[PDB]
Design a protein around this nucleic acid. Structure first.
Ligand code: K
Ligand code: K
Ligand code: K
Ligand code: K
Ligand code: MG
Ligand code: MG
Lengths: 160, 120, 129
RNA sequence: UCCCAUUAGCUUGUUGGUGAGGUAACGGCUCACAAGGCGACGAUGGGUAGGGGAACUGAGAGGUUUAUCCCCCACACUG
RNA sequence: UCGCGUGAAGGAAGACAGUCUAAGGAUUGUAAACUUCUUUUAUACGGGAAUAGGCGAUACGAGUAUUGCAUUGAAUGUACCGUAAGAAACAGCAUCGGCUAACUCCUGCCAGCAGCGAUACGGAGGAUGCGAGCGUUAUCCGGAUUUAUUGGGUUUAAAGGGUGCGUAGGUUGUUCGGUAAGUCAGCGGUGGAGCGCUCAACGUUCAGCCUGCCGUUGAAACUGCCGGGCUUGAGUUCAGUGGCGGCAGGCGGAAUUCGUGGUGUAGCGGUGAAAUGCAUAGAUAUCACGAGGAACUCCGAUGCGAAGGCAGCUUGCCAUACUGCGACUGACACUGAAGCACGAAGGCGUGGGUAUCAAACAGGAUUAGAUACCCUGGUAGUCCACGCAGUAAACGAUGAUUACUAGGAGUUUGCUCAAGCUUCACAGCGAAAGCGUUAAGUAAUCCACCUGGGGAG
RNA sequence: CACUAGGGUAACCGGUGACUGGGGCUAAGUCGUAACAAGGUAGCCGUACCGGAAGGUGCGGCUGGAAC
């Protein structure tokens, strides 16, 4: 995964995460954030702070710190790709130019942050936000451009 | 399983049961009020009005009476539809208000069509 | 052995996973054809055939970048338990045209591109990309 | 071209041959030697359905159901 | 199901409702003042659906004129006055979801879920959907991959048969030729753009699939079949090395039980403490002789067997494994539904035997009770032979076969090498614990099994 | 020859019956404490015998057990 170290922020989900102590229950606040510039660079992070704005800010900082470069062309994907992370599995396929993003939720947030316009996306695992976004970014990272495939194989006129 | 195992045996698909089996794939049935009594919910502690009714399809069931104030009594012809009550074991049917012997709720000004009350 | 072609694909895949540079195989005619197809399509560095007292040996030197192999996935399609036959009008595209499918045809053993050019179908041996 | 092996053997004109009769017509269709035929690729027995194109509905795989319409089959209180 | 109407443009913050004595929402909403009539009503004109005697002449076809003919029906449509005049409901507003003040109740109630019993119940005011409809119930599909060929799984969530042998069936190392069953190809037969509805649903026409079935010609890479080959898989032979592998016959010492006799006398035994029990008509202990039954200390943690299992010594008869040969045959292979065989302990039947231990049973203790745990007795059983029975946490909770993929620490045998035997541990796998060359990694073949929990094996 | 009608034995599909036994859910009134910690006698599987009841004991097996 090429790290490639302005991107807008998208809040995927927040969680009311608790703790048990003899005195009582102490509550934290977690948040998954994805940063992207709709260009081919997307990062994700997890903020774990007390207040909701503090958690969102920490997640934004973590997502900005951890960024990768996703090879894209126009607004579609070069080929179909399936990837599983944890209890979640994702499948992405290219679609027609006048189709838009056909998926909702964490998949929609990740694909909007990466800027892909036309894509057919389906989730076959669980609806966990962490594993879902991680599987989607893994699927995007394992994606090879036609130029990259040509460079790895040799000649660039292999498709003929 | 292997391809030959599937060829020899195949796959078996079950049938989903119907949530209202006493209706016999009908929207509503007609019955007579065999008994009219009151039951206690399974953390609610109310007094829910129910009627044991013998339907014309040769079946006896328990039907809840929604609303406040029922003019029904024993040996009354009622219209019974589907729909169960969560906090009451047993009963799984409702009695339509404003049909046959059952009368509409008096003094109702909202949700009138669900309790058979005309426009005032 | 049950599926020698699947065994050949598995040997190649295991060598790629282990990051070896060469891999040896007990030779066969259809496997000689498959490795020739792979070499002319640009997935391995080179090959060599050694005709010994046995059926023979195939030695394949794989292709690595300046440390990623040129081959990403090998998938056997027509297994003995379920044979797959297709025509030229219904032949499949592997990795949306960026990968190949080795196909045995009455005109010989070639890829899906050459098979669709020659208008002939047959057995789909494997998907390679 | 539906389920049941908590349905394993079934059939005695049943399988074939000769001859005759009968039929619009071939034929155990019927009437006067050899013995067979059919079954774990499900005979036989039991339960339930009229069958298709349509129609509805799934990216596809398909599936559901014959409400109107069209084609075939069966029937006209019961034999 | 489709289409239309219930009016169109201006008119400041009336009266009456709410929420706060004024302000905000209803609200440009009403009231008047200016036009239009789709539509309703009254009148008139009113289509379309209706097309079907001579003059060639082949003497008859056939081509040309005329005649009446509408159930729908004042029905489309067209036109004329005088008028906004005749025409809007239903659901839900705490989250999922679009939409919030006040009064009730504090049971009555409501719910698809988180549930509230109120930004959830009932009303009043406003809000939000849809709209001649709006909701409730019933039925069927998709999301559901909740039967998974495309497209799931079985160590611990449901899920590997107790283990083998094997029938039908499924699968088939390498190579040289034939054939054409599967497969592939060709040729035949068959089965979106307009137009009209004033628009639309809807009618109607052509471009467009026939990609299902059948016939007829060709191709030979792969599967199948036929005819030969090869030795690497498989098997046979030979040599070496084994072994708590099976069956059967003999031989043993320690401990312990009983009977009969020497010595000897105030207790022994048991428990947390005791007691029930044995013992001066002679115990425990101790020395002998006689008669028996059961189990095999040290080695001893490792090895063998398909599994269950197998341990004193020795012999006989069997089986089997591992390694190699320059010996042989030539794919003879894998798996395996039915069936068959074996299968711990406990249990059953007949005949033996019967020392220890010991269900049931009896007594003594502890407890509120003790139908138990502790103690003392004690019969089946535990042992042998033959025959039934067919179960287990029969477990590595992990089926068999084949090929491939990293390192460390030990160990046994055959000699640094190859078999086997167990724990840390790359890639990879997994939900995680973890597995990791003896995989739970990468792949192929066949079998067994799972589809929410009880009911219920 | 067979449509029926008649007797009789045999099936299958069904009702009812003096009396006699499981299961589910709601109450929880009573009686004990079996399991979860070494749950106060480690637990569980098979089998046999015996108890108001959960259970107890004997024989073999397992760790899905402590503790040494
Ligand atoms: K480990
Ligand atoms: K207890
Ligand atoms: K205990
Ligand atoms: K065992
Ligand atoms: Mg389990
Ligand atoms: Mg096993």
């Amino acid at each position: 995964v090429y790290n490639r170290v302005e991107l807008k922020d998208r809040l995927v989900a927040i969680n009311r995460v608790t703790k048990v102590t003899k005195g009582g229950r102490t509550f934290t606040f977690a948040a998954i954030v994805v940063v992207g510039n709709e260009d081919g660079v997307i990062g994700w992070g997890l903020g774990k702070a007390g207040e909701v704005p503090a958690a969102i800010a920490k997640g934004v900082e973590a997502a900005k710190k951890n960024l990768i470069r996703v090879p894209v062309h126009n607004g579609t994907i070069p080929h179909e790709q399936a990837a599983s992370y944890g209890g979640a599995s994702v499948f992405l396929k290219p679609a027609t130019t006048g189709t838009g993003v056909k998926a909702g939720g964490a998949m929609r947030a990740v694909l909007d942050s990466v800027g892909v316009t036309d894509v057919l996306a389906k989730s076959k695992g669980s609806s966990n936000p962490h594993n879902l976004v991680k599987a989607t970014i893994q699927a995007l990272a394992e994606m090879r451009s036609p130029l990259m495939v040509a460079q790895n194989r040799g000649i660039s006129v292999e498709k003929v | 399983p292997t391809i030959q195992q599937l060829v020899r045996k195949g796959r078996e698909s079950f049938a989903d049961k119907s949530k209202s089996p006493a209706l016999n794939s009908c929207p509503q049935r007609r019955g007579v009020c065999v008994r009219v009594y009151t039951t206690t919910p399974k953390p609610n502690s109310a007094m829910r009005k129910v009627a044991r009714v013998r339907l014309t399809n040769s079946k006896e069931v328990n039907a809840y009476i929604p609303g406040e104030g029922h003019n029904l009594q024993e040996h009354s012809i009622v219209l019974v539809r589907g729909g169960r009550v969560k906090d009451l074991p047993g009963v799984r049917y409702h009695i339509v208000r404003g049909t046959l012997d059952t009368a509409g709720v008096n003094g109702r000004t909202q949700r009138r069509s669900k309790y058979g009350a005309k426009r005032p | 052995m049950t599926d020698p072609i699947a065994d050949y694909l598995t040997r190649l895949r295991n060598a790629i996973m282990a990051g070896h540079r060469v891999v040896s195989v007990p030779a066969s005619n259809i496997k000689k054809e498959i490795t020739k197809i792979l070499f002319d399509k640009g997935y391995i560095l080179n090959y060599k055939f050694e005709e010994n007292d046995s059926q023979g040996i195939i030695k394949v030197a794989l292709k690595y970048d300046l440390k990623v192999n040129a081959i990403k996935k090998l998938k056997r399609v027509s297994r003995p338990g379920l044979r797959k036959y297709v025509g030229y009008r219904d032949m499949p595209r592997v990795l949306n045209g960026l990968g190949i499918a080795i196909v045995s045809t009455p005109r010989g053993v070639m890829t899906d591109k050459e098979a669709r050019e020659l208008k002939v179908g047959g057995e789909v041996l494997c998907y390679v990309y």
